[PDB]
Amino acid sequence: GTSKLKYVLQDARFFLIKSNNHENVSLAKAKGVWSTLPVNEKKLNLAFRSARSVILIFSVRESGKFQGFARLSSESHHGGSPIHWVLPAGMSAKMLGGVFKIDWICRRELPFTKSAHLTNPWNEHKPVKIGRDGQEIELECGTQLCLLFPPDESIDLYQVIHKMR
DNA sequence: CAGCTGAGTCGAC
DNA sequence: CAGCTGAGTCGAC
DNA sequence: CAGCTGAGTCGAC
Fold first, then answer.
1. What happens after mutating residue 56 to E?
2. I want to staple A137 with a disulfide (CB 3.0 to 4.6 A). Which of A14, A95, A109, A110 is the partner?
């Protein structure tokens, strides 16, 4: 039943996350962490402090797909275990220094062809697949996008819901 | 001294 | 059975 | 997050 997913998404804020490669998204799924560029990092830290849930919807550049979505469980933190990100040309470790903890809600993929009917009113009513890293998605649009994902049987939402209450 | 730059897709060609 | 698909840049948005 | 960018002359063409 979608009621427990809908619970997590109530009053949430939604952000498109773009990755230059697949490897860092697979690493994010294995380790439950994410790092982003500094302007987006500050925006996510601010959203985490005020929003009931901050939802990151992942899409690898030029893949034509979303690869899943996750909920922020902490602000970004520096120091400790350095994440062995695969750095594309022009990307540095210091560029991505802050590490967010995230809890995956769905790790299954959704191709753009199945979201062709969803438009984001916070991006000129363009299709939700249109956007740069950190593009905010309006509440209703982001909710419907997350509900389009097939259910992920490898996900138990207990830990997420427990830390929310 | 401060702002930019470094994780957009699409169609034409 | 045979053809396609898998190593284009650019500007609009 | 850090480095760059924003007060060179000259000769070939």
1. Does not affect ability to influence alternative splice site selection
2. A14
Identity of residue A69? F
Q: In what order do the strands lie in the sheet with A68-72?
A: A33-34, A100-106, A68-72, A53-60, A12-19, A136-137
Experimental method: X-ray
Segments forming the whole domain that contains residue A158: 1-165
Q: CA A144, CA A146: separation in Å to the nearest integer?
A: 6
State whether the beta carbon of A11 lies below 7 angstroms from any atom of strand C.
no
As ranges, strand C nucleotides with an atom below 7 A of a protein CB are 13
H or E stretch including A24?
Answer: helix A23-31
Could you tell me which residues are beta bridge partners of residue A56?
Answer: A15, A70
DSSP β-bridge partners for residue A55: A14, A71
Max distance between CA atoms of chain A, in angstroms, equals: 44
How many structural domains compose chain A?
A: 1
- How far is it, in rounded angstroms, from Cα A133 to Cα A40? 8
Name residues whose C-beta falls within 8 Å of residue A131's C-beta, 6 or more positions apart in sequence. Answer: A16, A18, A120, A123
- Residues β-bridged to residue A89: none
Indicate yes or no: strand B within 7 A of the C-beta of A20.
Answer: yes
